[PDB]
Structures are given as structure tokens and as C-alpha cells.
């Protein structure tokens, strides 16, 4: 897996600020990192994650061999550190998704997420979704919101929001909703890559996600010669469909690219 062929694109769109962050790096000889963070309420929370995630992960790697466990601890560590940082005034309502992929030894893929940023494995030409959206229509998420003293309010567009404010049920930051069910504990997915079958991994933010489903995302990517082109093609398509949000994509090529 060569990081020199990863594609990335981040387009601000019709917003005053780009609140998306993305990154990838080689953390150790065995472990590669890829992440998108889709901010809301100001970029503070996404930028924080973008600034602190590598080190938080690298510190944990000699202590935790289980990548799913590691990523869970890391997300909670990062949220704890962010909350100290905001405390010490819009920062109290700054929040972010976080979708983090670790790839160990070129073959063991672990994805941890809170929120609605997607990670899609293209396996044998078909989308395999490696995240599930943390949104208020989800039965388990609904139930935990009520259990912790939050509630769901539906806006005039028929969209559900936690306490009438937040469209997702897990995030980093959103400190005012951390005691009402909006947790930083991620869900994780583990998959063994198969380099004959597996074509790429694509991470996307809501500027894309609101415009296209995950099959359409794979479609855009597959019509492109390289990941770099693919990553721009995905973001530009979202914009052409009239998206108003920041649009960010990371395309990581695998054996079957
Ligand atoms: Mg956003």
C-alpha cells in the first residue's frame, strides 16, 4: 500500500468556512492511518481531532494490540482532551464526526466512527459499507437518547434532531449534549482485505453524503483513472448536484485498483 497514490479533495462549497478535515499518514512500519472529520458549529472540534489523533493513536499502539479497542480508547481520550480545551464560548457547541481507518500489515482494516461520515470498501465492484450512520431514526440510538434525558424533535422538513439541535447521535465535542446521549464512543468494523477483490477505500463527508448514496459514490470513483482524480470527481459531483456543505473525499487504492 503506497501513500503516494492516495487521492484527497476537500471543497468548501457555499460556506463561510471549511469545517471538514482529512488526513492520512504512516504511523509505524505496520500501521497506516486515514481519517475524515466533518465539523459543525465552528471548526474547532474537527481541527482538534485533526491536530491530535495521530499522537493519541501512536501512544496507544504499544499498549493495545486490538485496533478496535485502541480506536475506542483513542476517541474517548480525544473527546476528554477536547472537552477540557473548550471549557478553558462557541467551542461548547462545536462538534465533529470522526471516521478513522487503521490498516495493519497491509491487510487488517479497522474502521471506527462516530456520526455520519462514510467509509466504503469497494469489494468485487460492489460497495461494502464499513460504518453505520448515527442518526436519530436508528432504534438503538433513539433509545439511548431517551434513556440519558435527551429527546428527538422533528423540524418542518421532517428531519429529526437531538434536543432540536443535532442531526447525529454520536460525535466528538457537542459538549452540551454529552450528558443527553450524544456519545464519543465509536462503532467499529474489522475486515480482512482481499487484494484480488478489493479495489479501494473511500471516506466521504456530508457534502457528498447528502447528495449521493454509497453505490453512486463507488460509481464516480470507478470511472476515474487514479485515486487523485477520483477524489476530486466525487467532490465536484456533489457540488454539481447543488450541495451547500463542505465536501471531502479520501480515496485509498488497494490491490484490485
Ligand atoms: Mg460539516
Amino acid at each position: 500500500i503506497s501513500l503516494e497514490n492516495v487521492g484527497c479533495a476537500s471543497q468548501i462549497g457555499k460556506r463561510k468556512e471549511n469545517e471538514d478535515r482529512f488526513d492520512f499518514a504512516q504511523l509505524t512500519d505496520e500501521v497506516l492511518y486515514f481519517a475524515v472529520y466533518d465539523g459543525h458549529g465552528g471548526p474547532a472540534a474537527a481541527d482538534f481531532c485533526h491536530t491530535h489523533m495521530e499522537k493519541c493513536i501512536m501512544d496507544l499502539l504499544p499498549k493495545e494490540k486490538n485496533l478496535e479497542t485502541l480506536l475506542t480508547l483513542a476517541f474517548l481520550e480525544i473527546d476528554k482532551a477536547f472537552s477540557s480545551h473548550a471549557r478553558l464560548a462557541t467551542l461548547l457547541t462545536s462538534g465533529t464526526t470522526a471516521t478513522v481507518a487503521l490498516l495493519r500489515d497491509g491487510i487488517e482494516l479497522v474502521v471506527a466512527s462516530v456520526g455520519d461520515s462514510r467509509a466504503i470498501l469497494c469489494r468485487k465492484g460492489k460497495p461494502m459499507k464499513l460504518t453505520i450512520d448515527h442518526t436519530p431514526e436508528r432504534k438503538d440510538e433513539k433509545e439511548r437518547i431517551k434513556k440519558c434525558g435527551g429527546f428527538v424533535a422533528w423540524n418542518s422538513l421532517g428531519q429529526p434532531h437531538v434536543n432540536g439541535r443535532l442531526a447525529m447521535t454520536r460525535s466528538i465535542g457537542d459538549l452540551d449534549l454529552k450528558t443527553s446521549g450524544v456519545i464519543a464512543e465509536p462503532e467499529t468494523k474489522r475486515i480482512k482485505l482481499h487484494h484480488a477483490d478489493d479495489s479501494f477505500l473511500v471516506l466521504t463527508t456530508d457534502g457528498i453524503n447528502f447528495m449521493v448514496n454509497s453505490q453512486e459514490i463507488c460509481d464516480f470513483v470507478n470511472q476515474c483513472h487514479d485515486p487523485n482524480e477520483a477524489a476530486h470527481a466525487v467532490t465536484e459531483q456533489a457540488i454539481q448536484y447543488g450541495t451547500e456543505d463542505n465536501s471531502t473525499a479520501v480515496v485509498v487504492p488497494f490491490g484490485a485498483w
Side-chain angles (χ1 to χ4, degrees):
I1 315 311
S2 75
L3 294 185
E4 64 255 21
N5 302 139
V6 176
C8 54
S10 189
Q11 290 198 70
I12 186 176
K14 298 314 187 170
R15 285 290 190 276
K16 197 225 154 62
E17 206 148 14
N18 196 341
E19 304 186 311
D20 281 2
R21 298 282 177 281
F22 69 85
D23 206 4
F24 55 89
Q26 175 186 319
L27 291 188
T28 74
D29 284 319
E30 301 81 36
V31 176
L32 309 181
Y33 158 78
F34 312 94
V36 291
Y37 306 100
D38 174 346
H40 51 265
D47 202 67
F48 192 92
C49 284
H50 181 268
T51 309
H52 299 290
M53 196 62 73
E54 290 165 282
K55 201 224 190 136
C56 175
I57 293 168
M58 293 176 294
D59 290 347
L60 278 160
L61 282 169
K63 314 192 252 179
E64 182 60 67
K65 188 172 174 180
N66 191 307
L67 296 188
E68 294 181 281
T69 299
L70 187 157
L71 283 168
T72 300
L73 293 176
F75 275 44
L76 294 175
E77 277 177 24
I78 283 271
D79 196 51
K80 173 189 153 192
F82 175 77
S83 92
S84 306
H85 169 75
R87 247 76 136 143
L88 153 180
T90 56
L91 267 63
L92 298 170
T93 44
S94 193
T96 188
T97 71
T99 295
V100 180
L102 294 180
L103 179 65
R104 182 212 262 154
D105 299 312
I107 43 97
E108 172 193 353
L109 180 61
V110 175
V111 185
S113 62
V114 292
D116 63 12
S117 296
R118 298 183 186 147
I120 291 147
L121 181 69
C122 190
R123 174 157 286 182
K124 289 198 240 199
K126 297 185 183 175
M128 167 171 310
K129 290 144 175 184
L130 304 179
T131 58
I132 313 158
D133 287 1
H134 301 123
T135 55
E137 320 210 23
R138 211 174 107 179
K139 287 317 190 66
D140 53 341
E141 301 298 289
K142 261 191 88 127
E143 140 175 26
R144 186 190 66 255
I145 298 306
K146 290 186 303 283
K147 188 204 173 173
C148 298
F151 61 93
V152 175
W154 297 81
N155 70 20
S156 53
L157 309 168
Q159 311 168 319
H161 282 79
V162 181
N163 292 29
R165 282 100 123 299
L166 192 52
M168 67 190 58
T169 50
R170 309 194 188 194
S171 76
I172 306 277
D174 302 300
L175 277 178
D176 113 70
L177 292 162
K178 278 283 173 299
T179 60
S180 297
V182 181
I183 61 178
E185 188 207 326
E187 292 184 301
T188 70
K189 187 100 177 182
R190 179 182 166 180
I191 301 294
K192 192 177 179 214
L193 288 196
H194 189 313
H195 292 294
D197 298 335
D198 288 340
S199 177
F200 52 85
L201 174 70
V202 57
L203 317 176
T204 59
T205 58
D206 273 348
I208 290 136
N209 304 334
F210 293 155
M211 293 304 103
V212 282
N213 62 40
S214 84
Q215 178 65 61
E216 304 169 295
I217 293 159
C218 278
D219 293 335
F220 297 146
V221 174
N222 281 132
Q223 47 195 20
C224 300
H225 159 233
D226 52 62
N228 175 229
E229 176 192 349
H232 286 95
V234 170
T235 58
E236 183 45 42
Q237 282 311 290
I239 288 159
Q240 282 319 293
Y241 292 176
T243 201
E244 308 247 349
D245 301 330
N246 314 133
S247 307
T248 297
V250 176
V251 179
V252 184
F254 293 143
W257 178 267

